[PDB]
Structure formats: C-alpha cells, structure tokens
Design an enzyme around this catalytic site. Structure first.
Site: not given
Ligand SMILES: Nc1nc2c(ncn2[C@@H]2O[C@H](COP(=O)(O)OP(=O)(O)OP(=O)(O)O)[C@@H](O)[C@H]2O)c(=O)[nH]1
Ligand SMILES: Nc1nc2c(ncn2[C@@H]2O[C@H](COP(=O)(O)OP(=O)(O)O)[C@@H](O)[C@H]2O)c(=O)[nH]1
Ligand SMILES: [Mg+2]
Lengths: 95, 244, 50, 186, 439, 430, 50
Positions: E254, E179
């Site tokens: 994790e 853009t």
C-alpha cells in the site's frame, strides 16, 4: 544544582532522572573511612599517605597510575546495554 | 627619496575633547561593555609561489674564460650563431649539459647563447643524444625550480623539442618522470579565466597552462605503455590521451 | 621591510590587531590638532627612540 | 526568443565569429576556463571551454530560467573538435502531451536506459574536427512513441572547442550547405 | 501466511538489527532462547509471529533474518551474545578482510566471494515462505562494505526476483557531523546504485535523532543504542499492520501505490510521536490532536531537513492505540487549515491514514515510556533536495583535485563511474525542481 | 584473524620492542613464562593477532629480532619479559656496521639478510591471514637505517597487497648524538618514501620536553621514553584486538588519512598525561582529553603544528563514552581553529571508539595527525646534509664500498622534491 | 609610557596599546623571509630569514 555523580565519571546514555536516581542511591557520597572531622581539629589523627619504590639507578622510574581506574569490569557495551528481561520491572510499583 | 612631514599630517573630523584621568570602569558593569578582541595569528601562507633566488650558472663561468666554440653573428636581423667547429664533431657528453645549465641565465648574451645553442645541438643530434639522458636531469629540474614564468616556459619548450628530436628517447625518459613532473603539479591549472573576450597570447606562448598540457600530452604520446601510469601516479588530475 | 611596510602591514588588518592605534586620537593639548593614525605612531616611534 | 520568427532552412544559435558570439548564453564556471583562440587544425578563431569536473562547467542556451527558448525546428547539429576527454550535452524537448522531457548524451557512458524524464545515450567520437547531427525525431518517436512539438533547451558541458551550433531541418550535404555553414577542410 | 525477509549488512546494519530483534521478540513474548514459555502467555492469536518467524515444528522459532559482514568482530560478538541460540548458526555470514570504507573493495574485490553464498541463503529462506511480501534491508550509507554489498545485493535481487518489493532504510551522513572523511564519495556512488534498484528508501541521518533525544527524552549523553531503539520502534509501528488487527489496515504494497508520484522519486523522511520519558509522560493528555501536531512541527523530523523550505507530495501516517476515525479526520482538517504547511498544486488530498489497535511495546531498560496512542509518519516532500545539494557540494570540493581517487581506481573501478553518479544526482535535482513548479 | 607480525632491528628498535612486548603482555595478562593468568574473558578471544600457541599451552610473540652486532640480543635476553621470544628468530652479524649506512645496506646487509628473509617468509606463511607488517627503527644509526629499508624493499616486492608500518626515530639537530646523522637519514628517507605505506615519526627532543614539562618528573630515561612509545603503538591497533562501537583497522586508517600516495608521514600524541601528584585532581572527561590532545605541546615531534595547516586528523578513543560528546567536541575543535585546517576537504577529522580502555585508565586517547608541519624537519635535515656535503666531509668512509656521490645527489634532489610537493598543497585554494 | 605620552601630548593608554600592537613583529617574522631593518634612531637591527 549539582547532582554529585554526573560530571567526574561521564555517565552514558540514559535518562537524566535515571542517572540522578542511580548516582544518588549508590553508596559513598558520605560516611568517613578516615574519620576526619570537618572542623579540622582532628587533622593529625590520620597521616596523609599514598599507598612503589622509584629508582632511577638504571631504568624506568615512571610509576603506575593511582587506584582510581577500572579492572575486571572491562565488558562490552552491547552486552551491558542489551539484556532481555532480567531487570527491574519498569512499571511494577506494588499497590 | 621623499616622505611627508610626519608631525604635520592630521585628522580633522575627530573632536579635540580629551577625557583626562576621570574615567572609571568600576561601578558601571553594564552587560554591554566592550571587551578586547585578542590578537589572532594570521593565516600561514608559506612560500610555495615565492621566487627561487636563481643559483649561479655554469655557462657564464665557461664562456667568460672562453672554452666553448660559439660565434655570435650579426649579419642577420636577429643574431644567429655560427659554429667554429661543427656540432657533429662536438662531443655532446661534455658540452650539452653545460648548455642546458646555461638556460637559467638572464643577462645577455649568455641567455641568448644558451637557449639558441641548445636548439641547434638538439636539432643536429641524431643518436648520440640517447646516452646523455641521465646527467641532463640535474639542469632541467634545477631550472624548473626557479618558479619564474619565462624560464619555465623556455624549459618546457626545450622539453618538447628534446622529446620530438629523436626516437627511442621517450621510453628511455620513463624512469626519470618522478623528479621532473612534480613542478607541473604547481602550474597545471594556472590559466586565465579571461571569459568571453579575445585572447592575444597565442602569438607568444605565455599561457603556461596550455604549454604544460601540450608538453604532458606529447610525453604520453611518445613515452610508452607505462607513461600513463607514471603520469597518473605523479599528478592526480591527469586524463589519458592515447586511451579512447 | 624598512619599518614602514610594517606600518602598512599592521594598519591593513584591523581585525587581526584591533586597538586604539587603528584610529586617530585627540591630543591632550587643544593647541595641537589630532593626528592621522599612520603618522601618530611614527611620532610615537621617534619619541621612544630618542 | 526565436518564437514568432521566420525559420525555414537553418537556425544558428551560437557562432564563434563575432564581437560577442554568446549574447544569450549564460556561463557558470567553477574550476574551468573559456576563451576563443585561433585553431591550428582550422585557421580560424574558435570559442573553447575546459575545466575539471565536467558536471559543474557548462553554458546554458537561455540567459536566465523561467522562459522558453523553444526552437521550431527538428534537426540539431554541432561542429565539435575531439579533445579525447570527457564531454556531455543535453537537450530538453516538448512532446505532443504538455510534458518537458530530457535527452542527455555522454562521451564516457556505456549503458542506455529510458526514464520518464531523462534518457541518457553514449557517443563515439572520431579523431579531430567533426560534424555531429542530432535527429531527435527518431529519438522521441522510438523512446517515447510521441511526436515532438518544440525544442526547449540546449546545454553543452566542458572540454570542447565549439565552432557552430545550428539547426539544419533536414539531411543536407556539403553542396547544399552554404559556404559559411560548411566547414572548410585544412 | 504473509512473510517478509530482513537483510542486515554493515556494522550499522548489524547494530540496528540487534536492537530491532530485541523489540520484536519482546513484542511477541518469545524468550531469547527462541522458545515460547509454556506458562505465562502474553499474546493472543496465532500466525502473528509468522510474518517474521518460522515454526520449527516443535518449540522454538527461527527469525527470518540474515546478517552479513566482512569484519568478523560484530558477528562474533552476536554469536557469543545472549541471543546465540536464537539465530541459525550458519546464517551469520562473516568474511575475513574488511572493505576499510572503500566502496570499490566491497563492490568489486572482496564482496563477490560472499554474495554467492548470501544469495544461496536468500533462496533457501524464500523457498520456505508462500506469501512473500518483500524484503527490508538495513545498511549505513557512509561505509564501504555496507554500501557496496547493499548495492550488489539489490542489483542481484532485482534480476533474480523481478517485481518483489524491497525497502532500504539508509542512514545518510549528517550535514556537518560525520565520523569518516571519504563517505561523501561512497554515499553518492551507493545512492546512484540504489536509485534505479530500490522501491522505497528512508532517510535516517544521525544528527536529527541526536537532537530529538536531547530535547524530548532529556538525554545529554546519547549513544548508538538509543538511536537504534528509536529506529526499531519506527519499524514496529510501520509493520504492525501486517500482524495486528486494525480498523484501516495498510499493507507494504500500500506504499508503491500511495507515496511515490513518479518512479524516480522514492526517498522519504520519517517522524515519530510521542517521544517522552516516564518522569513527565503522564502529566498531560497525550491527545490525538496534539500528538499529530507533534508529528508535523519541523523540530521533530527524523532527518536534518526543513519541511518549511518546500512543498509536500504525500503523507502516509499510522496511529496505533485507541484512536478513532472521527478524531483523525478532525486533526487532518486542522492540519490542512494551518497555513505554514502547503501542499503541491496537483495534489488536492495528500494524506493516507492507517489505524492499528496494538499499542507500542516498551523495552525494559530503555528510554521511552508506555503510552496508548502513537503516530509514525512518512512524508515525501520537495524539501529533500537540500541534502543532495550539500552532499553534491562536499563531493565536488574533493573531486576537484581528484583526492582519494587512487584508493578506488586501484581496485577494479574505472575512472569514469564517479561522473556518472554526479550527473545522475544532477538529474535528480532537476527532477525535483521540475516537479515542484506549479502548473 | 587479520594478524600482523613484528620485526625489529637496530639498538633503538630492539629497545623499543623490549618495552612494547612488555606492555602488550601486561595488557593481555600473560606472565613472562607465557602462561595465561588473566581475569577477563576478552583477553584471549583475539589473542592470536600477536601470539602463537605452542604445545604445553604457552604463547610466543611473532617477532623477529635482527641486527649486525650480537650484544643487543645478548642484552635483551636478560631483561624482564625477554624469555618469551623464540631463540630461532634471532639473527645477528659478527662485525657490526659502525653507523655506516653503506656498510649496513651494501656490503653486510646483502650477505646477512637471506636468513632473516627466510624466517620472515616462514612466519608470514604460518599465519592464517596476513594484515601487514610493522617495524620499529631509528634513522640515526647506520645498521638500522640500511637493514630496515632494504628489508622494506624486499618485503614490499613480495607482498604488494599488504600494509607496512614504520615507527621511525628521526634525529633532531638540537640533541644530536651522532655526527653522521644527516647522511644516513637522507639516504634512508629516500627509499622509505617509495615503499612504506605508513611512517610515524618520533623525536627524542620532543620526548624530553613532554616528559619534563608535562609529567613534572625529575629524571626521565630511555625506559620512560620507550614506555610512552609503547603506549602510543598499542593505542593505534587496540581496536583491531578489542570490540568497539566503530572498529577502525589499519587499512581503514590508511584509506582515511592519506590523500595522495607520497604523503604518508605522521605525527602522533597520547592523552591524558598527568604528573603523579596532580593525577588526583584532574577530572577525566572528553573536553580535557581533546584540549590536551590538540595542544601543540603534546605532539611526539619537535614540529610545531600551528606553523602549518592540518591535512587530516584522526582520534582513537579507548574506554566507555557517548558518541555525542566525541563528535560535538570534534565539531567544536574544527570550528574554533578553522584557519589551521585545509579548506578544500570538509570535516577533516576521523573518530573511532573502542570500549576496552588501557589498564590503569578510565579513558584514553591516541591522536594521529597528517599535517603540513613536517616540512621543517626536512628543511633542517636537508640544510645540515648540504652543509656537510658541500665540503665532501665524512665521505670516503661511504665511498669505500662502491657507492658514489651521484646517489647522494639523487637522494638530496628527491628529498627537496618531496619538501616542495608537500608544501604545495598547503597554499592550494578552491 | 608616561614620558612618551607627555612628549607626544597623547594618551598613555593609546601609546601603551600602540606599543603592544607593534611588539607583534614576531608574527611577521615567523613567516619565511620578510627581512626587517628597524632603525628608530641609533641602533640598526637587521633580521634575515631567521
Ligand atoms: N545510526 C547509526 N549509525 C551508525 C552506527 N554505527 C555506525 N554508523 C554509521 O556508519 C557509518 C560508517 O559505517 P559503519 O557502520 O561504521 O561500518 P560499515 O558500514 O560496516 O563499513 P566499514 O567500516 O568499512 O566496515 C558511519 O558514518 C556512521 O554514521 C550506529 O550504531 N547507529
Ligand atoms: N627511544 C630510545 N631511543 C634510543 C635508545 N637508545 C638509543 N636511542 C636513539 O637511537 C639513536 C642511535 O641509534 P643507533 O643505536 O645507532 O641505531 P642502530 O645503528 O640501528 O643500532 C640515538 O640518537 C638515540 O637517541 C633507547 O633505548 N630508546
Ligand atoms: Mg564497518
């Protein structure tokens, strides 16, 4: 082949089937306000009128646009797209 | 001038079979039939590097009628001009812009006289060079517009000698950078990527990229505090020298 | 441009001006050998000028 | 490639006095230029690189990748003229563990940090010609706490006039330096 | 008692925040007013909202989110929107002057007058929490204010909090469709800034999502709302393990122990399946095997990159629905046997799998249909160097002539910070090619 | 919030403003008495940008009308929507400049401009937060060309950080109404290039051509020309007043359209434009809008865009649309005409969207293109200027007020310098 | 083009394409400079810059 609504007024981001269903179930696409027949025998029943006085004597003369453009419906895209639950139930289908 | 006999030049490999009228693209609409390639306008290249059509010089019209005191002497191996009257008594205000204008000339002896006289006047001048700066701007930019490599190199050498000639001149020159620099934007990067092999051009400073960089760093060295901001506003790709 | 540098300018760019002119063409009369692309369009110009 | 080759006192990789001073070096130039010209400060021919976007303009020590230029020797040293512009160089080294680690050195950087693969360091360059010595031994031992085995790669970027690149192997002064290695003052 | 704080900065950040915060509210049954209805309860359990909300003591709930911007248009739009009673009135920070796509303006000129109040708000919010898991941050990378404020916020938080986890969900410019015209510059600068400050970064370029919407959802005129909804679904699938019971739960922590082989390499790309409309969703099995095959064909990558051009380091991927470990293992074995997908030499096993029970919710008026089984996959692969190569080329093309450099150097930034980002990106590409070679 | 004040001077500027304010008031639903009668809520949210509230609940434009002859305001008083203006802001001389730039910049402007500068200062300090200034003026008239440029200098030396827009009417050689046009045009451009942050050029000849061959209307007039100019002006700043998908204010446009500080002269265009009779048949979609946008005929300038290569392009869409259409159309346009776009900056078109369309349209487009085509305007005006100045014709009228030919020579030199530098980047290659 | 083709013993289609190819001298002319002196016989047509 040619679902009527789509091409003229560009339909925004939504499912193809959803847009087709909307622009098919919407009004218009039929019924005669003018009552002209498709044959052409009735051509002079209605005089072809376009409902300002153009005057070039002093100023202007451009004339405004035709009555096929929106008003009052100016409303924000985030508003239209973003409502919470007051919609049709996506999976209701009473049995 | 010469030209081949045109009706005789010919092609051999092409066959002499001729289709005649019998042809017809109707009824044979194969999907692989050819179409035109419609005419395409060529890319516009303009004339940014085209020649300038050097304008008329003032040195020729003064010298042919002979109102400048200058003497060509052939005693030396290369001609060395001697002065009918001395440069210090010579008024720089009337003469010096004319000598600057004379640089555009190419025909002898006008070019010879113009450049050599500019060197001697700049070397001789001590302080009177300072007031005459404003009107020197027209000849220098007119010469720089020529888009000719030899004239451009000579003029950049002129600028170096002028700046190194006397003190106080560089910062006086600061307001006038705007109209003299932008030609340098054209030719800042015009240097040869000769690669590994030796370059022989160090003898004759025709490497306009090296000349332009040398002139620019000299201007920044001599100018003052606003010299860098003016240079950076004018040419984008500049890099500071005084700033570590 | 003496009308011949025009010849060079149009012949040097086949993609910009594609057409039958870019290559040699057979003559309708077998007695005449096919002409080279540069010269054939000279001959066209001479004929049109006359 | 300088492997299995006797290397005792010095090792000159690039030397601007020859028919082709860079047999092994590979050049990739986008907007710059390379040439040797006689120098005004030192009346001798010096190979030279300039350009914009110092990142893209560089010359690599080995001609092509996938092969080891590994240098036997501890002490790097270069003769560089100060052009008061941007200038970077990097060396790739092999440590005690089978790991290839990278030291980048920049003129225009103001902060230094340690990373498992790259360690950038600023420099401050004096005016004019100068001799810069890269120990590299203290550098690996302090940043990585690991001894160095081999020196893989050397890379020099744009905006410099380069006289000699060699390995000195120990702090040597001008008296110990051979005449061709020492820089004769103007 | 586990909490996470969400930061939205930039117009893209605000617009994706609206979409996601609709989704979480619908998932937890909270009305837009913030009040859980007295009647018609839909969600069992307690403390489940506590990951994203905080109880007011009596009734309504406060989202753990903050909104930042310098142009008041989007924030005023939110404050007049239907969710005005949801957020705190004084956590929607609005400036007066926009950065106007200028990274220097938002990093040195006008953002410094807002960051103090911002960090004050962050301290106020983090004081309430007790088991703070970390922060999520949203910012379009091709925008001045978004990039600059995000970079400054990350730099301040890294020294304020130390070892807390922070996850950045960046929307990089597409290879050819964009853009603005200056965004390569600020993208490179912001990537340089966050590379040494963010634990995990996610690639979410626009063109890939456009193509996904075109192929699967059968959308021919997609807009920003659909992309935002899809990203919201991805976020929900990622974080469902912290608030829904699961067979093999996966924590936010994790990730920094499973996905990133080395500290430098922490940019990953996502994928989601199934993506299908209700008009043809129910005609097939939605079997776990074919959905996980749908997760891995290169056609459904959320980022415009080709996985076939490079090796894989790691794949962490989560199912939600009625999946079983037997079927997960059977599908993973099939994927390994497949030949077009190859892993790096020093990684014998590269799959981390999560299973969660709660099926994805459906937003009324949306596009997606209701299904039981869904998979969201995060992959770290060597193929991502190509986007860096393309943005590097686009960058140096303009930086060769020093275009647009004045619009940055006139606002406090020196000349030499561009070249530092350039050499840092070169170092990143060298790191990727170094890691990618076999031993 | 982020407001901009309006300053108009000269006959052409006053005529442009008299229609610009009518268009803006009609857009916002404000009657000529200043009492709100609109229907939509968004009409008043950001109304403070151009209007000040007064006791009694009425609204007043923050516009300052300036001129050296009183007839212009004595005429704009009587027009429609003319009662909105404050009587105090009007500043006028009693003699007039006589199309003489020297008189309008040296001997009369210096004396008069004190009061107008005081009023501008008052209006500037009145608002909560300034965005910049916008001024509409013509380069063919002496009083406008001198007053406007000296006012730009005065405002710039006082507000170094604010932005300036100048809507400049440039004289074309074909349809010429003043024999002194080249002189004051060159003198004005010399000062304008140094100070104006954005300049937006408009050509009467191009306006005539478009209103003739696009609109298919028999007899256009200055009212119609001003209406087109007003639509073009409103399109640029609409997204500053209304919400949008990608809001893009004036500062964003300035950053993303100007590569180098001296290249800030732009050509513009508006779409769609259709005849009264053929409006019923056209299907309004973005392919038609972009093909009419990029057409050479639709530009507001006599410059032919395909004679040069675009540096940058910008499109502001109004209405409700999908961004996929916008960006894929822009990609298609840039791919199809790749020869006309400069190659060393990739993807050189900016797009922006606002969801509130102009009244009377589903969808509209405003195009602003920074292109290398404007060199020919400068070449022609310079040629006319040097042809007339070689004989020192019409020169004593200017020299009678202390101005001498060295200023003319410097103006011409800098003008050609700008021409050369501006065509420099056309031939640059990687 | 028929008499011209008959005179040159060449194809009408190729001679017509040849004319249409040459008649794009406007493309050459639009570029600055490029003075043209086309003779092709009795008329000498000169064009300077413009
Ligand atoms: N995925 C997605 N990206 C968006 C959206 N809106 C804007 N962007 C991206 O954001 C980039 C520009 O930044 P914006 O979000 O528009 O605005 P900003 O980040 O606040 O920066 P400024 O414009 O200077 O205020 C564009 O290149 C888009 O790619 C959106 O709704 N969804
Ligand atoms: N668009 C528009 N242009 C006008 C109008 N009146 C005059 N012009 C143009 O303005 C030029 C003359 O400007 P002038 O009135 O002398 O400017 P002033 O000296 O500042 O008053 C002419 O070339 C006209 O083309 C108008 O009503 N509308
Ligand atoms: Mg923004």
């Amino acid at each position: 082949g040619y679902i009527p609504g789509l091409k003229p007024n560009n339909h925004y981001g939504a499912s193809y089937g959803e847009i087709a269903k909307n622009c098919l179930s919407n009004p218009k696409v039929a019924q005669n306000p003018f009552k002209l027949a498709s044959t052409g025998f009735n051509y002079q029943r209605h005089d072809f009128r376009d409902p300002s006085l153009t005057a070039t004597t002093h100023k202007f003369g451009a004339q405004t646009l035709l009555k096929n453009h929106p008003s009052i419906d100016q409303k924000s895209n985030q508003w239209q797209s973003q409502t919470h639950d007051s919609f049709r139930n996506p999976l209701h289908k009473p049995n | 001038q010469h030209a081949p006999v045109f009706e005789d030049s010919q092609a051999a490999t092409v066959v002499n079979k001729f289709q005649g009228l019998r042809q017809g693209t109707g009824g044979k609409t194969s999907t692989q039939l050819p179409v035109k390639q419609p005419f395409q306008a060529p890319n516009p290249i303009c004339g940014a590097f085209k020649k300038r059509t050097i304008p008329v010089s003032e040195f020729r019209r003064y010298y042919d009628r002979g109102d400048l005191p200058i003497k060509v002497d052939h005693q030396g191996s290369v001609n060395k001009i001697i002065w009918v009257i001395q440069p210090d008594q010579l008024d720089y205000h009337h003469y010096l812009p004319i000598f600057f204008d004379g640089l555009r000339e190419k025909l002898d002896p006008y070019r010879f006289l113009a450049i050599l006289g500019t060197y001697d006047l700049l070397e001789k001048g001590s302080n009177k060079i300072l007031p005459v700066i404003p009107q020197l701007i027209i000849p220098v930019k007119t010469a720089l517009n020529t888009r000719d490599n030899e004239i451009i190199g000579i003029m950049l050498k002129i600028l170096q000698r002028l700046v190194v000639s006397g003190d106080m001149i560089g910062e006086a020159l600061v307001p006038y950078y705007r109209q003299i620099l932008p030609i340098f934007n054209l030719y800042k990067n015009c240097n040869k990527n000769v690669g590994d092999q030796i370059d022989y051009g160090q003898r004759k400073k025709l490497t306009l990229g090296d000349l332009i960089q040398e002139t620019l760093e000299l201007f920044e060295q001599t100018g003052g505090e606003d010299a860098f901001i003016n240079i950076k506003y004018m040419i984008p790709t500049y890099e500071s020298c005084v700033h570590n | 441009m003496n009308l011949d540098s025009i010849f060079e300018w149009i012949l040097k760019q086949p993609i910009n001006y594609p057409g039958k002119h870019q290559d040699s063409q057979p003559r309708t009369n077998p007695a005449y050998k096919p002409l080279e692309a540069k010269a054939q369009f000279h001959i066209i110009f001479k004929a049109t000028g006359e | 490639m300088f492997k299995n080759t006797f290397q005792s006192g010095f090792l000159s990789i690039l030397y601007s006095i020859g028919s082709k001073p860079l047999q092994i070096w590979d050049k990739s130039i986008r907007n710059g230029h390379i040439k040797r010209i006689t120098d005004q400060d030192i009346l001798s021919s010096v190979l030279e690189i300039m350009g914009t976007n110092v990142s893209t303009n560089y010359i690599t020590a080995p001609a092509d990748p996938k092969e080891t230029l590994g240098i036997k020797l501890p002490f790097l040293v270069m003769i560089i003229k100060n052009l008061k512009k941007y200038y970077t160089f990097e060396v790739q080294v092999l440590d005690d563990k089978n790991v290839r680690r990278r030291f980048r050195a920049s003129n225009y950087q103001s902060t230094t940090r340690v990373k498992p693969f790259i360690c950038t360091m600023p420099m401050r360059l004096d005016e004019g010609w100068n001799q810069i010595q890269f120990n590299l031994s203290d550098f690996t031992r302090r940043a990585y706490a690991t001894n160095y085995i081999e020196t893989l790669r050397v890379q020099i970027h744009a905006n410099c006039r380069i006289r000699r690149i060699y390995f000195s192997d120990r702090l040597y002064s001008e008296e110990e330096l051979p005449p061709e290695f020492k820089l004769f003052l103007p | 008692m586990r909490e996470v704080i969400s930061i939205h900065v930039g117009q893209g950040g605000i617009q994706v925040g609206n979409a996601c915060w609709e989704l979480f509210c619908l998932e937890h049954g909270i009305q837009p007013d913030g009040q859980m209805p007295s009647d018609k309860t839909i969600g069992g359990g307690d403390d489940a909202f506590n990951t994203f909300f905080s109880e007011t003591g009596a009734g309504k709930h406060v989202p753990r989110a903050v909104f930042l911007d310098l142009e008041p248009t989007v924030i005023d739009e939110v404050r007049t929107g239907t969710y005005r009673q949801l957020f705190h009135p004084e956590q929607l920070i609005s400036g007066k002057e926009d950065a106007a796509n200028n990274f220097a303006r938002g990093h040195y000129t006008i953002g410094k007058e807002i960051v103090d109040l911002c960090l004050d708000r962050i301290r106020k919010l983090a004081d309430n929490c007790t088991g703070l898991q970390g922060f999520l941050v949203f910012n379009s990378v091709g925008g001045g204010t978004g990039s600059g404020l995000g970079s400054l916020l990350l730099e301040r938080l890294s020294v304020d909090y130390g070892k807390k986890s922070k996850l950045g969900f960046t929307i990089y410019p597409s290879p050819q469709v964009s853009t603005a015209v200056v965004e390569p510059y600020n993208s490179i600068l912001s990537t340089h800034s966050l590379l040494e400050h963010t634990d995990v970064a996610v690639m979410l370029d626009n063109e890939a999502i456009y193509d996904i919407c075109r192929r699967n959802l059968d959308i021919e005129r997609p807009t920003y709302t659909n992309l935002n909804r899809l990203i919201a679904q991805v976020i929900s699938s990622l974080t469902a393990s912290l608030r829904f019971d699961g067979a093999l739960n996966v924590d936010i922590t994790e990730f920094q122990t499973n996905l990133v082989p080395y500290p430098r390499i922490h940019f990953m790309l996502s994928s989601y399946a199934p993506i299908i409309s209700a008009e043809k969703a129910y005609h097939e099995q939605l079997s776990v095997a074919e959905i996980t095959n749908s997760a891995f064909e290169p056609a459904n990558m959320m980022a415009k990159c080709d996985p076939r051009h490079g090796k894989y380091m790691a794949c962490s991927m989560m199912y939600r629905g009625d999946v079983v470990p037997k079927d997960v293992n059977a599908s993973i074995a099939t994927i390994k046997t497949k030949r077009t997908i190859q892993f790096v030499d020093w990684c014998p096993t590269g799959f981390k799998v999560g299973i969660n029970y709660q099926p994805p919710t459906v937003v009324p008026g949306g596009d997606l249909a209701k299904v039981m089984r869904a998979v969201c996959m995060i992959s770290n692969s060597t193929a991502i160097a190509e986007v860096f190569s393309r943005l590097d080329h686009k960058f140096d093309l303009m930086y060769a002539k020093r275009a647009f450099v004045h619009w940055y150097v006139g606002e406090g930034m020196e000349e030499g910070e561009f070249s530092e980002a350039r050499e840092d990106l070169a170092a990143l590409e060298k790191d990727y090619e170094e890691v990618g070679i076999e031993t | 919030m982020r407001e901009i004040v309006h300053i108009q001077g000269g006959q052409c500027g006053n005529q442009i403003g008299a229609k610009f304010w009518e268009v803006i008031s009609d857009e916002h639903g404000i009657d000529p008495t200043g009492t709100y009668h609109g229907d939509s809520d968004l009409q008043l949210e950001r109304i403070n940008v151009y209007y000040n509230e007064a006791t009694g609940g009425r609204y007043v434009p923050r516009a300052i009308l300036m001129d050296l002859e009183p007839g212009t305001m004595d005429s704009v008083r009587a027009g429609p929507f003319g009662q909105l203006f404050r009587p105090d802001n009007f500043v006028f001389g009693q003699t007039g400049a006589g199309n003489n730039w020297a008189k309008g910049h040296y001997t009369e402007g210096a004396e008069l401009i004190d009061s107008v500068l005081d009023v501008v200062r008052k209006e500037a300090e009145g608002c909560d937060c300034l965005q910049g200034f916008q001024i509409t003026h013509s380069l063919g008239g002496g009083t406008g060309s001198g007053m406007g440029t000296l006012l730009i200098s005065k405002v710039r030396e006082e507000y170094p950080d604010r932005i300036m827009e100048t809507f400049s009417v440039v004289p074309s050689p074909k349809v010429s109404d003043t024999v002194v046009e080249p002189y004051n045009a060159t003198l004005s451009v010399h000062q304008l290039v140094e100070n104006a942050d954005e300049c937006m050029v408009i050509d009467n000849e191009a306006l005539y051509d478009i209103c003739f061959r696009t609109l298919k209307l028999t007899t256009p007039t200055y009212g119609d020309l001003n209406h087109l100019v007003s639509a073009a002006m409103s399109g640029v700043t609409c997204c500053l007043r209304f919400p949008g998908q990608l809001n893009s204010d004036l500062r964003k446009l300035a950053v993303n359209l100007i590569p180098f500080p001296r290249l800030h002269f732009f050509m513009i265009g508006f779409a769609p434009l259709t005849s009264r009779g053929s409006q019923q048949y056209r299907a309004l979609t973005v392919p038609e809008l972009t093909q009419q946008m990029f057409d050479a005929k639709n530009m507001m300038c006599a410059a032919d865009p395909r004679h040069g290569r675009y540096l940058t392009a910008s499109a502001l869409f109004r209405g409700r649309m999908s961004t996929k259409e916008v960006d894929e159309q822009m990609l298609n346009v840039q791919n199809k005409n790749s020869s006309y776009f400069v190659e060393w900056i990739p993807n050189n078109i900016k797009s922006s969207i606002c969801d509130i369309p102009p009244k009377g349209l589903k969808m509209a487009v405003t195009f602003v293109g920074n292109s290398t085509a404007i060199q020919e305007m400068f070449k022609r005006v310079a040629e006319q200027f040097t042809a007339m100045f070689r004989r020192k014709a019409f020169l004593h009228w200017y020299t009678g007020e202390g101005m001498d030919e060295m200023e003319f020579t410097e103006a011409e030199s800098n003008m050609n310098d700008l021409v050369s530098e501006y065509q420099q980047y056309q031939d640059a290659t990687a | 083009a028929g008499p011209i083709a008959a005179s040159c013993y060449l194809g009408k289609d190729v001679v017509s394409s040849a004319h249409n190819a040459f008649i794009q001298a406007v493309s050459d002319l639009t570029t600055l400079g490029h003075g043209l002196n086309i003779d092709f016989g009795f008329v000498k047509v000169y064009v300077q810059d413009r």
